[PDB]
Paper text:
Zinc finger antiviral protein (ZAP) binds CpG dinucleotides in viral RNA and targets them for decay. ZAP interacts with several cofactors to form the ZAP antiviral system, including [name], a multidomain endoribonuclease required for ZAP-mediated RNA decay. [name] contains three structural domains, an N-terminal KH domain, a PilT N-terminal (PIN) nuclease domain, and a C-terminal CUElike domain (also known as a CUBAN domain) that binds ubiquitin and NEDD8 (18, 21, 22, 23). Here, we demonstrate that the [name] amino-terminal extended-[name] (ex-[name]) domain is required for antiviral activity and present its crystal structure.
The asymmetric unit contains two copies of the ex-[name] domain. In each copy, the domain spans residues 12 to 198 and is composed of an N-terminal type 1 KH module (KH1, residues 12–74), a short linker (residues 75 and 76), a second type 1 KH module (KH2, residues 77–144), a longer linker (residues 145–161) and a C-terminal bundle (CTB) extension composed of three alpha helices (residues 162–198). The KH2 domain has the expected β1-α1-α2-β2-β3-α3 type 1 KH topology but in KH1 α1 and α2 are near continuous constituting α1′ that contains a pronounced proline kink surrounding P29. Inspection of the domain packing within the protein revealed a substantial interdomain interface that packs KH1 onto KH2. At the center of the interface, these include hydrophobic packing of KH1 side chains I34, F35, Y69, and L73 with A104, H110, L124, and A127 of KH2. These are accompanied by surrounding salt bridges and hydrogen bonding between R33 and D101, R65 and the mainchain carbonyl of S106 and between Y69 and H110, with R33 also π-stacking with W105. Additionally, the CTB extension packs onto the KH2 domain making an interface stabilized by multiple interactions between CTB α8 and KH2 α5, including a salt bridge network between E196 and R134, R134 and E189 and R141, as well as hydrogen bonding between R141 and the carbonyl of the mainchain A185. The computed Complex Formation Significance Score of 0.0 also suggested that the interface is unlikely to have biological relevance. This conclusion is supported by solution size-exclusion chromatography coupled to multiangle laser light scattering (SEC-MALLS) data that revealed that the ex-[name] domain was exclusively monomeric over the range of concentrations tested (0.5–8 mg/ml). Therefore, the dimer observed in the crystal likely is a result of crystal packing rather than any residual assembly associated with an ex-[name] domain homo-oligomerization function. Further analysis of the interresidue contacts in the ex-[name] crystal structure identified exposed arginine residues, R33 and R65, that make salt bridges and cation–π stacking interactions at the edge of the KH1-KH2 cleft that potentially could form part of a protein binding site.
Author numbering: 12 to 147, 157 to 198
Write the structure that this text describes.
Amino acid sequence: DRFAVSAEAENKVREQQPHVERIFSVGVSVLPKDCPDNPHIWLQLEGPKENASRAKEYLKGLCSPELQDEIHYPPKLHCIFLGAQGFFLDCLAWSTSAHLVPRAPGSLMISGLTEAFVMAQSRVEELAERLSWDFTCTGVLRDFSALLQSPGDAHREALLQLPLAVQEELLSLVQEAS
């Protein structure tokens, strides 16, 4: 299956191409235009149909976002979006097809089609809510420790010091993405 986007947004497609490949594990191909004055370009996505559907929605949303806005949360939750070299952000982008850009600590720019923005907002809200489910280092799930073994990671500490409820949701997100 193929689909079209604005020719004026080809620049965007190419900037994001590697991230799209990494996140959805797909190939992005742009077809040559049949005429120069064409307002659209056709894309073809290479990979499993699941991966491709999600990439499609990401790319549509990237090229002309139906929603673009900052979500706001406790600054101490910001490590989740920067830690493990962006692994969690990637898993969240996978699960929602939203384009996600960390801003100030406690601020995340979410962007894409509307159903993608709301589902990402929702998931980010849930994480934030679960920070309040602290009932106090202070405890770590084995499987969570397991993902964060990459020693250089500068947000490794902050992540480990997250309460177990946030850790469990992050596991659930990673599990969803694999």
